Amino acid sequence: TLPFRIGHGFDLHRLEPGYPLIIGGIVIPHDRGCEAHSDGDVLLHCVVDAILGALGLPDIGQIFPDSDPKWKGAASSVFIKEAVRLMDEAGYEIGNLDATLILQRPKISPHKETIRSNLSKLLGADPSVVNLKAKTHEKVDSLGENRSIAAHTVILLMKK
Amino acid sequence: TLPFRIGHGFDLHRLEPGYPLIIGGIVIPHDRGCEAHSDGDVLLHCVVDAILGALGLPDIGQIFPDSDPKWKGAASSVFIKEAVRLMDEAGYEIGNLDATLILQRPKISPHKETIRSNLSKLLGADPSVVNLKAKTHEKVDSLGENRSIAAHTVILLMKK
Amino acid sequence: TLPFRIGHGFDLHRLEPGYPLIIGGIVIPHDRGCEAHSDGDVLLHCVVDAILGALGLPDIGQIFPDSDPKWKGAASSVFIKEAVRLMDEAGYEIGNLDATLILQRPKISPHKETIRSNLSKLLGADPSVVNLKAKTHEKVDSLGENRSIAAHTVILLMKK
């Protein structure tokens, strides 16, 4: 069994007027937000896919499909907790996590420590090993036109 | 010499009507496929670039250029096998691999284990350390309009 | 404290006619270049964000904001040197770095070793652990239309 396992997640959602903008569990006010079947939490979904992928498990759509055992309107916290449980039972913990959010507007930096603490609380990890940064998309393509929001996560898992 | 080496690959191809859609060696039927000089295998090309990049070698275009030693119409398997040979001679093996495919349509999940087994066979690695997930692009930009397909790979290499 | 720390950076800039194209400190002639408040160095900025992110520090905009202590027209070298200082004081060094540049035109490969040596010089790392590759964007979206340039970096940091 491997002492370290590397994961990558990506997620993108459409932003449309009058919808919720929820990032890592945190509500951020804005003229646009995520139009999705989920709660639209691009950061939470791609952290989940990074964990699942580091471990070689089925992906977020395979584990939590559109069709009930118990999902459909689950808060993204539900998917984060199930992913850390499966990680734990596989014999791994979080070494560190680095997420990049791509978002034209609004500014994420004022909410950053609030996001990091909530994401850390849900992962059961120390905030000193869970990181998030943000970037605009320079007014080009859908992301730049604020017609979408994307997140990348790279994660390094450690054998317990 | 370093016990671990990290790599990242990215590739994107145009999708046009009536072309082959080949992903990780596997044929997937679809109204569009890759218009390319390669066989268009976005997953295979970006795994190759992740390996090459983890090792600090020239990239896929530098190692396998348009101009014969022996390439031009090589199946992407040829590039995967040459990359694992160069990795081996550098003194490394695969720790784990996590690839993300971005594709609006069709659905990749039914073909997933078939893709993973073929990619594992070509890498000479166990399927339990080679992972692939897929994501739509929410109907935005070329990827969302099914006018292209992209792949990211993060890889962690281990010293033998 | 963790023996290894993983980082990811992303950056994108607009390309417009008659501007400088500077990549990893190196001038590359071209009919378009980066229109930015920075020197526009997408590779240098995203290496900085990968380092900062691996360490869990504030991001490039938070550490080097628009408002003087001493920035505003700093060459991107200034940000690279401050990032390696903060890495050093945190007790880390570079294990390896793999950057991917996405650029339709011009061709980066002829300048590649020049870029790698300059980036290595600024990081205080050996060129054998600092890697860069390049990719087109297949004539689609802003990147494909040469209306922008993007860079991804994955980095693995080692405890001293």
Ligand SMILES: Nc1ccn([C@@H]2O[C@H](COP(=O)(O)O)[C@@H](O)[C@H]2O)c(=O)n1
């Ligand atoms: N081309 C694709 C795109 C997505 N998928 C699957 O659909 C799920 C949902 O993807 P989206 O959130 O992008 O809709 C993914 O997590 C994956 O299981 C797929 O199987 N083939």
Ligand SMILES: Nc1ccn([C@@H]2O[C@H](COP(=O)(O)O)[C@@H](O)[C@H]2O)c(=O)n1
């Ligand atoms: N701006 C760019 C884009 C690509 N390239 C080189 O061209 C090769 C082929 O890139 P594409 O498959 O994107 O055409 C790359 O693997 C790289 O060697 C480059 O040298 N400069």
Ligand SMILES: Nc1ccn([C@@H]2O[C@H](COP(=O)(O)O)[C@@H](O)[C@H]2O)c(=O)n1
């Ligand atoms: N949505 C966003 C986008 C960027 N930012 C911040 O602004 C800085 C500059 O981002 P750009 O270079 O993309 O303009 C980032 O490094 C980050 O500190 C943010 O706080 N919220």
Ligand SMILES: [Cl-]
């Ligand atoms: Cl804006």
Ligand SMILES: [Cl-]
């Ligand atoms: Cl669709």
Ligand SMILES: [Cl-]
């Ligand atoms: Cl071109």
Ligand SMILES: [Zn+2]
């Ligand atoms: Zn999502």
Ligand SMILES: [Zn+2]
């Ligand atoms: Zn390709």
Ligand SMILES: [Zn+2]
């Ligand atoms: Zn920048």
